Each structure stands twice: as C-alpha cells, then as structure tokens.
C-alpha cells in the first residue's frame, strides 16, 4: 500500500542548506516521479519541482531555480529534496508526492507525511511560564476561565498538558505565534467550575524539550 | 505562465447530508488540466479529482468535477462526517503548477456568542520589562469575530496578535485568543485595558476591562 515516510524536522539557519529524504513503499519507484510541495504556516501549498525516477529529469519552480536540487536514489526507492542558502520564508512544511508517469495530466495522487523545516537566526530558549489567573473578569455565571502564557522560546514544540493528562474537558491550547523577536508564544487556557477555585488545584504542564526545559506552574485565583 | 487560481467561497459550513459545490477559476484558459485535493489539520493533502472529472482510485462517488471554460466545480453529492476539511484545486498546464487558495468547509451549527474573558499581565512577567493582556473567546460560531483592543478608550493597531482553534469536536465552536504586548514602561502610563469582541451571535459588542493595580 503505497507510502511516503519523510524525515524529520529541521531547524536551520539563514543562508544554511537543508536536505528531506522520502522513502518510498508498495510501489514499483523507478516507474513514476516524484514532486515537492511545500505549506508555510497558515498558508497554502506551492509546488517546487518535479524529478522523474527512471532518467533524472527535473523540472524546477522559477522562483527556486539554482537554490533547489531534487535527486532520487532508485536502489533505495528514495527521492531528496536540498534547499539552498535558505531563507526566513522558506519555514514551511515540505511534502514529497507521487506522479504517474504519462498522464495527459500530471496529478499528485499520494503524499508523504511533511517534514516541518525552520529557518531561523533564534537561539534555542525556552520558555517562561505565566499565570492566566482566574480572577471576577475571568468569570462567567459559575464558571472561569485560567490559563498558562507559554512567552518567548524557540524552536517549536511545547508540549502543555493540565494536572498531568487528567485535566481534558474545556481545555483549548492555542497555536504557537511567532513574535517579531523570533520567538514563539502560546497560550494554554481551561475553563472550571467557579465554585472549585478555592477548592482544586490547576496545573499547567510545559514541555519544552529543545531547550530541555519542563516546567509544572500552578494557576491560582487572585 | 504564471496562472493564478482563485477559489470561491473562501469558506463555507455545511451539514451532512448537504450538497455542497465549490468553485475555482483559473486565470486563463486550462483546457482540463486541473485536479481537486482535499487537506484535513496536521495531515497531507489527498487527491480526490484529476483532469477536472475524473473520479481517483478509492475516492467515494458522491464527489464528482466539472469544468466550464475556466470555470471549474468540486461536487460532494451528500456530505458526510470526514469530508469536513479544506478542498484546494490544482493547475498542472503551465509550470509553475498552482494550487487554489482553498475552500475550507467548516460544520454548520447555530449561533453561538463568544463567552470572554480578560487576563491582566501577571506579577511575574510585569517583573521582567514586559506587560502581556490577553483576551480569550471561548466556544463561539461562525468563525467571523472582531477583537479590538483599547487602551484608555485608544484603539490599539499593531501590537497585538490573535490565534485561533480549529472547531471543536464535541460543540463545533472555535476559540480565540488575543494578545496585545505592551513594554512595562508603556503598560504602566496607562489605566483602563479594554478588549472589545464584535461577533454576530452579540446584538452590541462586548466589552471586557479592567484598570491596571486593581
């Protein structure tokens, strides 16, 4: 059954070079092509090129011409994708495709998971941790929201988890924002019973594990 | 040739059982070199149509493609549970082959008002040369919501960013937060802290506030 297992997340910086693999599965490599596809955050999907297994033709984006070479290894049914001198806006998701060969319309009819790559002149940080406390303007008829500010770290992901995995219901952590520093921040916020702020212990789980940083704050009413 | 394509509605919601069409126009001619994808959150795209009409391996029968000129149309028949992600169309005439800027179809439910809540910057970070207030709203529907800011009744523009949750799978809402980043310097010349929701299921915006040191 047909897969395209790509690698791992990147974090690179500014004019540095990145190469993703893709390893194909269940079919037979060197009878199709393989294209490139890449989604920056919240945004939509830009083809890069395309590079037929059997002869090494490639087809590049203009806008990527001389920065992007696309190669495949047909011993080991596996294509690569090395983006040069790389830039801020080349942050993106990056997936490999399958083509069939010899359609009168070429079409992308499998898709390998993504590999997130990062470009960036950020130092590793982790991440301070803030009370969202609830307070009377985090009220509302019987119930109030809290919450933890996941400020200023770098790179993506932080893991936030609430007393331990055993707090689900009404939690909603938000998607990580990029500052204008470089840096990310998130928010982590949990609705609760009002009458059980005095009476029960809120926790916020980080994660940060680039930076090996791990941090349990308590949110308390003010 | 760089074609642009364009894809109308930009989003829509819909409920099972619904027939649900979705538009893209390319901006030239194409003859039918166009294929349908659909993407759900975190995942890969997936081929539904290619060459306009033609129905991929697997793909259930009620999505169906037709083309008119430079008109194309995605068709779900009957939606259903998983179709509920966002459909892009895709050019393969002229390299650079384009992708549409997708149709995301959200669930249909009823109006739902924002619940919002208004969090002072902590003791904590004030502390450390920064003010952080963050404005949350919770589980409201549609989409569509306005969260302005102001300061000592000072629209603020610029210094504040907002993200937002995919919709819920237990309620079908959304929830949005705010964040509008103040130096602690700046923070403190000023009293009143003000975020201001505009939202349909709200007959008059909503505002929640509070004045610094109380």
Same mark, same amino acid.
């Given at each position: ?30 009878? !199709? ?10 945004? %939509? ?20 011409? %001389? ?12 294509? !690569? ?71 200023? !770290? ?69 | ?62 999505? /169906? ?59 904590? @970070? ?6 952080? =207030? ?12 306005? =969260? ?7 629209? @603020?523009?610029?210094? /504040? @960013?907002?993200? =937002?949750?995919? @919709? ?34 709200? /007959? ?11």
């Amino acid at each position: 059954q047909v897969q395209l297992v790509q690698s791992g997340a990147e974090v690179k910086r500014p004019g540095a070079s990145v190469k993703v693999s893709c390893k194909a599965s269940g079919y037979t490599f060197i009878s !199709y092509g393989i294209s490139w596809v890449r989604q920056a955050p919240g945004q %939509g999907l830009e083809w890069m090129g395309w590079i037929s297994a059997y002869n090494g033709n490639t087809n590049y984006a203009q806008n990527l011409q %001389g920065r992007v070479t696309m190669t495949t290894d047909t011993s080991t049914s596996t294509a !690569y994708m090395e983006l040069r001198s790389l830039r801020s806006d080349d942050t993106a998701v990056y997936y490999c495709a399958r083509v069939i060969p010899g359609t009168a319309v070429d079409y992308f009819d499998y898709w390998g998971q993504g590999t997130l790559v990062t470009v960036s002149s950020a130092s590793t940080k982790g991440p301070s941790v803030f009370p969202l406390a609830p307070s009377s303007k985090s009220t509302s008829g019987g119930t109030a929201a809290l919450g933890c500010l996941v400020k200023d !770290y770098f790179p993506e992901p932080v893991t936030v988890s609430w007393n331990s995995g055993a707090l689900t219901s009404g939690v909603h952590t938000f998607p990580a924002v990029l500052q204008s520093s470089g840096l990310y921040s998130l928010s982590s916020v949990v609705t609760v019973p009002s009458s059980s702020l005095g009476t029960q212990t809120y926790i916020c789980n980080v994660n940060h594990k680039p930076s090996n940083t791990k941090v349990d704050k308590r949110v308390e009413p003010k | 040739d760089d074609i642009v394509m364009t894809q109308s509605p930009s989003s829509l919601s819909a409920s099972v059982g619904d027939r649900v069409t979705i538009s893209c126009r390319a901006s030239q001619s194409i003859s039918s070199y166009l294929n349908w994808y659909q993407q759900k959150p975190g995942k890969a795209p997936k081929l539904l149509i290619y060459a306009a009409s033609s129905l991929q391996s697997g793909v259930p029968s009620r999505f /169906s493609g037709s083309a008119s000129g430079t008109d194309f149309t995605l068709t779900i028949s009957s939606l259903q549970p998983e179709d509920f992600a966002t459909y892009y169309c895709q050019q393969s005439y002229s390299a650079p082959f384009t992708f549409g800027p997708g149709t995301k179809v959200d669930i249909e439910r009823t109006v739902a008002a924002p619940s919002v809540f208004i969090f002072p910057p902590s003791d904590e @970070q004030l502390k450390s040369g920064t003010a952080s =207030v963050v404005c949350l709203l919770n589980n409201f529907y549609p989409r569509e919501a306005k =969260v302005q800011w102001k300061v000592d009744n000072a629209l @603020q523009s610029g210094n /504040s @960013q907002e993200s =937002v949750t995919e @919709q819920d799978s237990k309620d079908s809402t959304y929830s949005l937060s705010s964040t509008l980043t103040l130096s602690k310097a700046d923070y403190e010349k000023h009293k009143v802290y003000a975020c201001e929701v505009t939202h349909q299921g709200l /007959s008059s915006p909503v505002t929640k506030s509070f004045n610094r040191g109380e």
